[PDB]
Amino acid sequence: GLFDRLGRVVRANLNDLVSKAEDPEKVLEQAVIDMQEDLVQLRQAVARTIAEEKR
Amino acid sequence: GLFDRLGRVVRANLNDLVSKAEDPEKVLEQAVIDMQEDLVQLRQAVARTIAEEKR
Amino acid sequence: GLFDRLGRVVRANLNDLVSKAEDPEKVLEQAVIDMQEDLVQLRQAVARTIAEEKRTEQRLNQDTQEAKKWEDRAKLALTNGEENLAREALARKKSLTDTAAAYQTQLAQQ
Amino acid sequence: FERMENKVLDMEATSQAAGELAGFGIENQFAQLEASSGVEDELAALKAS
Amino acid sequence: RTMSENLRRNLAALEAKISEAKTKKNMLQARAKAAKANAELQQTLGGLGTSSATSA
Amino acid sequence: RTMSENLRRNLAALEAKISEAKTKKNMLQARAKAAKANAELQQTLGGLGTSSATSA
């Protein structure tokens, strides 16, 4: 029923209130710090790859 | 009886109230995010298909 | 008694009130959405119908190449001078060829 | 049992046709053709420079 | 050799009737499911009556 | 030598049917999983109907 498609637009009202907060960087930081923990293992994986290459 | 066909038109009154809200994008987002979760498996399925092709 | 035929016309009074509402589309939508759920199964049924048609079609393809295999083992027998084995292969293929014709009629109706 | 699973092979064969009951067929993919032939035409016209 | 060949008639009959019954199983099952869909096509010609029930 | 060579026909048949059944296992399994994805492609042509259900 139409009420479900209305559910997307009333959650978009909430999305307007949180967009109006305008402090975007905070999630940019979240994204890049999560990848840093992966990146240390990722470089390790590259290193393991090189290590088989070296051995 | 006619009351059942009236039931469609009184639910259409509700459909007018929710249409008058005019924030359509919210369901557009719902549609495309649902397909993204499928799409990662869908590309995986293509990959599996290629993988049999490769093996 | 007349009161029962009056019952139709007093329900027609109600039918006038609901007709005066004039928002017909709502039931048009009801009709077409109900048929969509059936239609996905209906196309599936067509597909099942085609699927028997296909399973039979590949079978008939497999049969008609197998009929050649028996003729090929018979050509080997004929060129060798082994007519006994050629006639064994001749029995095999005829049996297959008539079953192939049966599947061709099964597909024709399908 | 394996033969029943072949009937699941016939079900997927049905399912690839099934888009046609939903009004999808070659007429859709025909656009990507007319397009991709146009892509080769413009890439040829580019490399002709 | 004489009675043995009649056993070959008998065995040839067993395989013939059994194999034909197997192709009947396919044809009848397929035809049955197909017929349920064809019956739903007749019912879909009747679907025009189900819409008529509120088209008034 | 005569019957022994018929055992070689028999053994040649065993390995042929078994090895072919192994390549059927690969082809059928692959085709089955592939078909689940192709069925999801038909369903994705149906995904256009799922968006239509609120596009109205």
Residue numbers in the entry:
A (entry chain 0), B (entry chain 0): 2 to 56
C (entry chain 0): 2 to 111
D (entry chain 0): 168 to 216
E (entry chain 0), F (entry chain 0): 112 to 167
Give the exact sentences the study uses for this entry.
A prominent member of the PspA family is the vesicle-inducing protein in plastids 1 (Vipp1), also known as IM30 (inner membrane-associated protein of 30 kDa). Vesicle-inducing protein in plastids 1 (Vipp1) is critical for thylakoid membrane biogenesis and maintenance. Vipp1 appears to have two functions: in membrane maintenance (that is, during heat or light stress) and in thylakoid membrane (TM) biogenesis and/or remodeling. Vipp1 binds to negatively charged membranes and membrane binding depends on stored curvature elastic stress.
In contrast to the Vipp1 rings, the monomer orientation of the α1−α3 hairpin with respect to the tube axis is the same over the whole length of the tubes. Nevertheless, the monomer orientation among the tubes differs; in type I tubes, the α1−α3 hairpins are oriented parallel to the tube axis, while, in type II tubes, the hairpins are tilted approximately 45° relative to the tube axis. Remarkably, from rings over type II tubes to type I tubes, the α1−α3 hairpins accommodate a wide range of orientations along the tubulated membrane axis from perpendicular to parallel (from 90° to 0°) while essentially maintaining the same intermolecular contacts to stabilize the assembly. The here-determined structures of Vipp1 polymers in the presence of membranes indicated that helix α0 is immersed in the outer lipid leaflet of the bilayer. However, in contrast to SynPspA helix α0 that protrudes toward the bilayer, Vipp1 α0 lies flat in the membrane plane and appears to be partially submerged into the outer bilayer leaflet. The bilayer thickness in all three Vipp1 tubes remained nearly identical at 35 Å, although the inner leaflet radius changed with the tube diameter. Nevertheless, the same or similar intermolecular interactions of α0 with another α0 and α1 + α4, as observed previously in Vipp1 rings, are present in type I and II tubes.
